[PDB]
Amino acid sequence: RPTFYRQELNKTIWEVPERYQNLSPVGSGAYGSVCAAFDTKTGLRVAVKKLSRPFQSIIHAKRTYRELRLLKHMKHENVIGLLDVFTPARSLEEFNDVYLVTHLMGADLNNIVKCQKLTDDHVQFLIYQILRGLKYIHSADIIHRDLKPSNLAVNEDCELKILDFGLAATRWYRAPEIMLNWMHYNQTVDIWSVGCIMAELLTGRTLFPGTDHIDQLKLILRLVGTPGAELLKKISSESARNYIQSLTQMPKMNFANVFIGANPLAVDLLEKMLVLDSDKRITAAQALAHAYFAQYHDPDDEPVADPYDQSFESRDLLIDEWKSLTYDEVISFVPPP
Ligand SMILES: Cc1ccc(C(=O)NC2CC2)cc1NC(=O)c1cnc(-c2ccccc2Cl)s1
């Protein structure tokens, strides 16, 4: 057991071992607060996350076990992986703090579009890596649900890593079915997000930069028109169907007229991506196979995930029960070489 040292960062109590040094807060990191630190041991720049009130609510205690289980299973280049997990606790009886350690990422895609248009080969490399990462996550029966440039991490070499997966001016990449309560969703809700992101990289501007839920939707549709005949029947919700008919009937717009000068194959993929029909929306594996990624697509170098036991998700257990399962996952952790 290493020696732990206490410090106060923006009125937060941080008790970390005698290896993580010069802790400086960076951003957010779902269900917690993130710090940039220097790991003695390896001599690397790492990211340290302190989970916020891990065992204070039923939703938190369940989410804490969920997050730790995900990080211990993720073994992929385009997916954030777990380097270390610690607690200032000696016994189960004093376990009320959880810390997660990962590699420190250079930047996020919110700055990688900020004020300049990207080259077509740059977009190709970024989107191919998002898709490769999503393919692996989806094969484990996990979906991001809140995919945005904020949780897409890049380094100096443009080597991408997906963050904050499987836990869920912000909802600008939200899919129409998981917003307008349409047909019982699938994994391609993330393909919609990939589509909105790809468009943003090429144009340099956000595709649907709404101000509220009503605006966001009018904007999505000022480009895909209104659902037509075969699709209007598929809509399950009695409430939201009243709004679709309330909207002025918009036609489907040509993506070549909005994405001017852009690669014809990039237009085709975006059109196969930004499909209102969740049933006909292209999958991560199918989108990798698309002609646009001819230079990068390798079926032999696009691995699928090992079986992920998610049976705990159907389990309704008490805080102290979830607290116990988490503690065993902290002590059973094998650090990667
Ligand atoms: C430390 C940590 C803990 C958990 C998760 C995570 O994704 N958990 C979900 C269950 C799957 C991610 C990180 N890791 C980070 O949150 C960051 C690493 N580097 C970051 C960064 C630093 C400076 C500038 C830009 C970035 Cl993107 S944030």
Q: ∠ CA(281), CA(277), CA(251), 5° rounding?
A: 115
Report whether residue 127 contacts ligand 1, using a CB cutoff of 6 Å: no
CA-CA distance, 87 to 323, in Å (whole number)? 12
- Of 187, 171, 191, 167, give the one whose Cα is nearest residue 179: 171
- C-alpha count within 13 angstroms, C-beta hemisphere, residue 290: 24
Judging by DSSP bridges, how do beta strands 32-39 and 45-51 pair with one another? Answer: antiparallel
Domain boundaries, the chain: 1-106+305-334, 107-304
Angle between helix axes 189-203 and 120-139 (nearest 10 degrees) is: 170
CA-CA distance, 267 to 273, in Å (whole number)? 10
For 89, the token pair is 């606790």
User: Locate tokens 């499987």: which residue?
Assistant: 166
Residue whose CA is at the smallest distance from ligand 1 atom 6: 164
On whether the CB atoms of residues 292 and 128 are closer than 8 A, the answer is no
Q: What are phi and psi of 38, to 5 degrees?
A: -110, 110
CA-CA distance, 191 to 137, in Å (whole number)? 13
Report whether residue 77 contacts ligand 1, using a CB cutoff of 6 Å: no
For 40, the token pair is 């003695």
Question: Residue 166: left if φ>0, alpha if ψ -120 to 50, beta else—which one?
Answer: left
Q: Is 26 known as a binding-site position? A: yes
Fold of 1-106+305-334: Phosphorylase Kinase; domain 1 (3.30.200)
Report whether residue 163 contacts ligand 1, using a CB cutoff of 6 Å: yes
Whole-Å CA distances, 86 to 4, 8, 100, 329, 333: 10, 18, 7, 10, 10
7-22 burial, b at 16+ Cβ within 10 Å, e below that, comes to eeeeeeebebbebbee
Residues acting as catalytic residues: 164
CA-CA distance, 252 to 217, in Å (whole number)? 14
Residue whose CA is at the smallest distance from ligand 1 atom 22: 105
CATH architecture for segment(s) 107-304? Orthogonal Bundle (1.10)
Q: ∠ CA(227), CA(231), CA(232), 5° rounding?
A: 70
Resolution of this model in Å is: 2.3
Neighbours of 169 (CB within 10 A): 7
